[PDB]
Design a protein around this ligand. Structure first.
Ligand SMILES: O[C@@H]1[C@@H](O)[C@H](O[C@@H]2CO[C@@H](O)[C@H](O)[C@H]2O)OC[C@H]1O
Length: 329
């Protein structure tokens, strides 16, 4: 039995999204065998770790840190600034909206507190997540963070984080950012940030992909080269490979089709080949889950319907895909 993280030890870290339930049972053994990086799937998000101004919730993340230290793993810090899973208190000032400097002060305190607690075990932080506008042609998503703080908010977040993160690298994280439209936009944003002295080390390519994307391998190569040209590290942060196109909302499938499993094995083999080709600029590859038993894809984009997006099947066994990505020299 070949260990994924050992097989890729000269290439990049190998990670998984986790919650505390993953430290038990068969997920626990998969993690210790195959993974040397952990990302809290939810527990370090603002709403979860800091639900009220005067209340932090550290128990779950403390457990994730403790497990990591006990098993010679390190964490990715996901995520400080995001338009989702952020509580309303941050943007409120009694019965008014909070002004720019009040939100900044709250953010400073949030980042100070979280980063101080976990900087010893976190090797990479998703400082800002999904700030690039995904649909319209404007550069930046118009979230409450962007609206209230203004366009400098990204730089402001990175400068604050840099005070408290030590050896930890600082990442900008996003989805669809291998696709040509978003890649161009993201390039412009990051280029501008770097020319303003923003201490950004790397770009996170979330890699929420599917088996039917014909442009994926070409897009991904374009993307890695483009981001690397800015002097940034690349991490693959949330890899999973759905058996459905985004807009296929069918709910009838009880198991994937044979075509689905073979295609999946192929796409996994192909993307990991690309990851090895660009190993000079890629420092970590994380999967958004461990086995098909627990995946956010079971409820997104369709509530209550099963998907099979990962490297271990619903019983915890390595899939054909797993053996394809460890088959190399
Ligand atoms: O449990 C779910 C998470 O897995 C999900 O994670 C998000 C997926 O989209 C990405 O763009 C984000 O970076 C990542 O945090 O969040 C929702 C939650 O219900």
């Amino acid at each position: 039995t070949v260990s994924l993280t050992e097989k890729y030890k000269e290439f990049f870290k190998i990670g998984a999204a986790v919650t505390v339930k993953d430290f038990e049972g068969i997920h626990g053994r998969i993690l210790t065998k195959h993974f040397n990086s952990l990302t809290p799937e939810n527990d370090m998000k603002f709403e979860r770790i800091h639900p009220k101004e005067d209340f932090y919730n550290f128990e779950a993340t403390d457990k994730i840190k403790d497990f990591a230290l006990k098993h010679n793993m390190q964490l990715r810090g996901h995520t400080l600034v995001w338009h989702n899973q952020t509580p309303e208190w941050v943007f409120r000032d009694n019965d008014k909206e909070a002004p720019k400097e009040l939100v900044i002060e709250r953010l400073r305190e949030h980042i100070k507190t979280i980063c101080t607690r976990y900087r010893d075990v976190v090797y990479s932080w998703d400082v800002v997540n999904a700030a690039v506008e995904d649909k319209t042609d404007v550069l930046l998503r118009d979230s409450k963070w962007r609206r209230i703080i203004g366009d400098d908010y990204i730089k402001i977040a990175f400068e604050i984080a840099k005070k408290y993160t030590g050896n930890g690298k600082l990442f900008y994280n996003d989805y669809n950012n291998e696709m040509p439209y978003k890649l161009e936009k993201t390039y412009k944003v990051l280029k501008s940030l770097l020319e303003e002295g923003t201490p950004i080390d790397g770009v996170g390519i979330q890699a929420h992909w599917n088996i039917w994307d014909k442009n994926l391998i070409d897009n991904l190569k374009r993307a890695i080269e483009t981001y690397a040209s800015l002097g940034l590290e690349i991490q693959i942060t949330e890899l999973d490979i759905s058996v459905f196109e985004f807009e296929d909302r069918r709910t009838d499938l009880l198991e994937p089709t044979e075509e689905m499993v073979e295609l999946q094995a192929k796409v996994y083999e192909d993307v990991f080949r690309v990851f090895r080709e660009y190993r000079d600029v890629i420092t970590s590859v994380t999967l958004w889950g461990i086995s098909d038993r627990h995946t956010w894809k079971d409820n997104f984009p369709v509530i209550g319907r099963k998907d099979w997006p990962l490297l271990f099947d619903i019983d915890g066994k390595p899939k054909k895909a797993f053996f394809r990505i460890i088959d190399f020299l």
